[PDB]
Design an enzyme around this catalytic site. Structure first.
Site, mmCIF file in Angstrom:
data_model
loop_
_atom_site.group_PDB
_atom_site.id
_atom_site.type_symbol
_atom_site.label_atom_id
_atom_site.label_comp_id
_atom_site.label_asym_id
_atom_site.label_seq_id
_atom_site.Cartn_x
_atom_site.Cartn_y
_atom_site.Cartn_z
ATOM 1 N N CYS A 113 0.797 -1.218 0.000
ATOM 2 C CA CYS A 113 0.000 0.000 0.000
ATOM 3 C C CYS A 113 0.836 1.278 0.000
ATOM 4 C CB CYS A 113 -0.933 -0.003 1.211
ATOM 5 S SG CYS A 113 -2.215 -1.261 1.172
ATOM 6 N N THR A 163 1.227 -7.151 9.286
ATOM 7 C CA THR A 163 0.019 -6.526 8.758
ATOM 8 C C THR A 163 -0.570 -5.434 9.644
ATOM 9 O OG1 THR A 163 -1.372 -8.265 9.733
ATOM 10 C CG2 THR A 163 -0.633 -8.591 7.455
ATOM 11 N N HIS A 173 -3.607 8.369 5.192
ATOM 12 C CA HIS A 173 -3.775 7.033 4.631
ATOM 13 C C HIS A 173 -5.209 6.554 4.818
ATOM 14 C CE1 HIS A 173 -2.125 3.607 2.695
ATOM 15 N NE2 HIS A 173 -2.168 2.793 3.735
ATOM 16 N N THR A 177 -9.635 0.966 8.927
ATOM 17 C CA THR A 177 -9.497 -0.146 9.854
ATOM 18 C C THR A 177 -9.461 0.373 11.288
ATOM 19 O OG1 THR A 177 -7.088 -0.071 9.600
ATOM 20 C CG2 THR A 177 -8.309 -1.615 8.202
ATOM 21 N N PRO A 178 -9.927 -0.423 12.255
ATOM 22 C CA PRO A 178 -9.920 0.056 13.651
ATOM 23 C C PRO A 178 -8.541 0.457 14.152
ATOM 24 C CG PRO A 178 -11.332 -1.865 13.430
ATOM 25 C CD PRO A 178 -10.613 -1.721 12.118
ATOM 26 N N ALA A 179 -7.525 -0.375 13.915
ATOM 27 C CA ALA A 179 -6.192 -0.094 14.440
ATOM 28 C C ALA A 179 -5.449 0.933 13.592
ATOM 29 C CB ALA A 179 -5.382 -1.387 14.534
ATOM 30 N N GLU A 210 -2.570 6.094 12.897
ATOM 31 C CA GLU A 210 -2.192 7.249 12.089
ATOM 32 C C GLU A 210 -2.576 8.554 12.773
ATOM 33 O OE1 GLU A 210 -3.832 7.170 8.188
ATOM 34 O OE2 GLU A 210 -2.483 8.719 7.411
ATOM 35 N N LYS A 263 -9.978 7.923 0.801
ATOM 36 C CA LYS A 263 -10.400 6.532 0.685
ATOM 37 C C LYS A 263 -11.825 6.308 1.171
ATOM 38 C CE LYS A 263 -5.818 4.365 1.035
ATOM 39 N NZ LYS A 263 -5.060 5.582 1.432
ATOM 40 N N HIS A 271 -9.645 1.792 -1.178
ATOM 41 C CA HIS A 271 -8.210 1.578 -1.037
ATOM 42 C C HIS A 271 -7.655 1.075 -2.365
ATOM 43 C CE1 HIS A 271 -4.363 1.168 0.533
ATOM 44 N NE2 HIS A 271 -4.583 0.453 1.622
ATOM 45 N N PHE A 299 1.790 -3.167 4.144
ATOM 46 C CA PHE A 299 2.152 -4.396 4.837
ATOM 47 C C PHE A 299 3.667 -4.518 4.954
ATOM 48 C CE2 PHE A 299 -1.907 -7.104 4.044
ATOM 49 C CZ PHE A 299 -2.545 -6.367 5.023
HETATM 50 NA NA NA Z 1 -2.515 9.691 1.466
#
Ligand code: NA
Ligand code: NA
Lengths: 75, 411, 412, 75
Positions: free
Chosen positions: B162, B269, B302, B306-308, B313, B334, B339, B399
């Site tokens: 990514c 990940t 980014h 996602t939760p984490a 970030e 996004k 994504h 990743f």
């Molecule tokens: Na960006």
């Protein structure tokens, strides 16, 4: 359709040429703008739509439209 | 020091097939997420994605050539043609050795990999297509464009998951700043909405399953997110040395000033809770550009929903900015495009550039209820007009814990 | 000034050895690591042989739970990277961490687990897909794992430029050091493409040799009876370090990395131009970046894939670049013994060029019975060659899409 | 206990941990060091051996070594 029409249809579609360009004395590489991989998948398409296995040594021998119609005829 | 500027843009996204149509849809909060229709999704937990609608490359790539390249390669070629045309650069035989490319992809040609392996499992290796390898590997986009335009300069392809889109652009600037090239076509392309792609990302439990409302599925920083949404497309920039661009009278969208990299060194990940790698990447981009966090007006985060990842970030941005954390703007496009993986950092870099040109910021849609304890303004629901914005920062995390950040300056 | 980059660590898995020194010893003896494939049925496959990694044991480095989460090429890259990190003797501190990163890539990546996961998909739907599919197959995960294993927080990139990856990943690693984003970098490539899809797809392009009756004589670069390249597996890893950073700790210093050039053919998607203009441009750019002349080159570790067109094109490029000194400079292809390691080729072959400068010996181009007519180059055939005055070596790598790369190494 | 004890064998096999540690009241994530992916492939291995199929919602509640045994025995 006769086998000549089917061979010319496969050639004209694989090499991306109009059916008026698919001439019997035209070469795939010299006249119709093919490379190795083009002629390889051309032969593979011929093998598919005719249910015939063509050895690699016997496939390099097929370089023009006439060679293709002669192989499909005799086999 | 050799300075690098952007002189050309090209883009295919789930919300538009050009730069300006995509930018218009992003400023209007438009969702490009819809149900998958090109394969049966009965057994798949996720049945939706951000697809490219009404894709027509027939005027650029012939059907004989189309059969020799995966969809992501076709996306990259089309976007690269758009960027080359938007730059107006004239390729001469004296120009050739100084112009190259730096274009990559996260996973590459999954679709044709599946097709060739299906033929292999059905009829042996004799049914594999002779174009299998050159139609799937990630560097072929850069290969074809260099053949199409006669580019003889350095061609590389960074595939850092990514983060590819940012890395490919950053080192392109580096290749220009070092002196190995005067012009570089950089970016990324991706088409992972395939059976293996959707199924494999759902196997890792990384995809959203909000099939009853796909346009509300992507909810970065919202309390009810349940994984990211897959997107397809490509982004291409034309980087050029500044004197080479003025001598040519080129159009100049912005200057590329900052490029930082980092590694999480944590998990394969998941990012660390504190977001140490994201902060290190942003800090290196700042110090490479020579500015402070306060001077950043907009951060195209980014924001994968996602939760984490969202919390990590947001924590990294808070760490990097401190007092300016309540001041600096941050948003995730996004939420609208999904994504785009290896193309994400590419297209989002374009957004960061266009923000400085139009002094406007695209929103983070579907942000109904932000996370508790988070005091950041994510530009929710609607876009926001701004003034004095001289610097934008674009993030990309992938990743393996690899991270990258880009900083762009006005004019 | 400019920051200088030196090589302070080596690691390698090859078809002729599982360490750096065993591979180098076997290469100087002209040993072939090519044998018949036995891990899948090759009845219908036109090519039945490859350069495989023999007796691979990573259990002391990668646990069995972790091995299932990574394709074979990732395991090769991890093992080679661990060897290189240990060979450098670098001590990772929390003040050292942010200045050490990696630049490791692959040509095609995890074909084996992609086949396995797609077979599970076609047999039992997307529910049978493994949750590790993506992190076990994509090409950057080698650099991912190593940075996690050693706590490296510096810049990590992954270049996947087909048969050129190994060189590019190393070259830009040096660039990242010379720019100031890192003081030490683990660079190289890993590859494991001897899978059903790999062999079948390369044979579908008619690019593989079919000399099944004698696999060790199949890879014959520049020989009149070549018929395509031979697949090889393995990994190569170098530890690049800034000169002052390396001198302060008293590290091992194999050689200095001075030259790095890149170019594109802008010709065909798989075939090189007949004259080899792109290869010559890459070599010339490497020379100018190092600041030397072609005459100063003692050995060229050629790409030498044993294809009819590719060998002629690279020989033509060497003729152009060197000119009068073309008959003097030595050039050889280690792919005659190891096969084509694809994205890892330029990695392991860079190591060979470096080791050439340390032992003043040149590995041969075996199976070179009859060179091409009219070519007057010395391809170091049949046996190895001892050299007395050698200060510079050149390593080439050319890949699909016309991308090219060259590296120059100087002794001490 | 075997044909139940199978579950503890697969647990220690999937998580790379000794059989003496797979206690009946153990949490894959807390004690045995299982991540989410280790937890999905663990449930997948349980599905493979017993020739059964667990919904994802029914797999969200399988987090202990004894939890696995009760539900497995059930279906
Ligand atoms: Na960006
Ligand atoms: Na070489």
């Amino acid at each position: 359709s006769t086998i000549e029409e089917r061979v010319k249809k496969i050639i004209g579609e694989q090499l991306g040429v109009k059916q008026e360009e698919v001439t019997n004395n035209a070469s795939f590489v010299e006249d119709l703008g093919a490379d190795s991989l083009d002629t390889v998948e051309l032969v593979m398409a011929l093998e598919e739509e005719f249910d015939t296995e063509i050895p690699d040594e016997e496939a390099e021998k097929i370089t023009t439209v006439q060679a293709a119609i002669d192989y499909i005829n005799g086999h | 020091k050799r300075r690098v500027v952007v002189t050309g843009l090209g883009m295919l996204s789930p919300v538009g097939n050009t730069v300006e149509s995509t930018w218009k849809a992003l400023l209007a909060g438009q969702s490009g997420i819809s149900l998958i229709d090109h394969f049966d999704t009965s057994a798949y937990a996720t049945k939706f994605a951000g697809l490219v609608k009404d894709f027509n490359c027939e005027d650029i790539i012939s059907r004989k050539e189309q059969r020799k390249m995966d969809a992501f390669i076709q996306y990259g070629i089309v976007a690269g043609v758009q960027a080359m045309q938007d730059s107006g650069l004239e390729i001469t035989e004296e120009n050739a050795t100084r112009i190259g490319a730096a274009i990559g992809s996260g996973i590459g040609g999954l679709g044709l990999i599946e097709e060739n392996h299906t033929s292999l499992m059905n009829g042996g290796p004799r049914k594999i297509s002779p174009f299998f390898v050159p139609s799937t590997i990630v560097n072929m986009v850069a290969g074809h464009l260099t053949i199409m335009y006669g580019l003889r300069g350095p061609s590389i392809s960074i595939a850092t998951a990514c983060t590819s889109g940012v890395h490919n652009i950053g080192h392109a600037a580096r290749i220009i700043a070092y002196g190995d090239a005067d012009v570089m076509v950089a970016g990324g392309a991706e088409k992972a909405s395939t059976p293996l792609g959707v199924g494999g990302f759902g196997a890792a439990r990384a995809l959203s399953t909000r099939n009853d409302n796909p346009q509300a599925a992507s909810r970065p920083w919202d309390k009810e997110r349940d994984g990211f949404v897959l997107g397809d497309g490509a982004g291409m920039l034309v980087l050029e040395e500044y004197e080479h661009a003025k001598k040519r009278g080129a159009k100049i969208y912005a200057e590329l000033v900052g490029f930082g990299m980092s590694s999480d060194a944590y998990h394969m990940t998941s990012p660390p809770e504190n977001g140490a790698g994201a902060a290190l990447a942003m800090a290196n981009a700042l110090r490479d550009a020579g500015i402070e966090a306060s001077q950043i007006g907009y951060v195209n985060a980014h924001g994968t929903s996602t939760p984490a990842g969202d919390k990590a970030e947001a924590q990294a941005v808070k760490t990097i900015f401190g007092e300016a954390a309540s001041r600096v703007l941050v948003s995730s496009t996004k939420s609208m495009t999904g994504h785009l993986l290896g193309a994400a950092g590419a297209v989002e870099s374009i957004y960061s550039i266009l923000a400085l040109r139009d002094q406007a910021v695209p929103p983070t849609i579907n942000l109904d209820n932000p996370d508790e304890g988070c005091d950041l303004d994510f530009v929710p629901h609607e876009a926001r007009q701004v003034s004095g914005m001289e610097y934008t920062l674009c993030n990309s995390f992938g990743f393996g814990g690899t991270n990258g950040s880009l900083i762009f300056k006005k004019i």
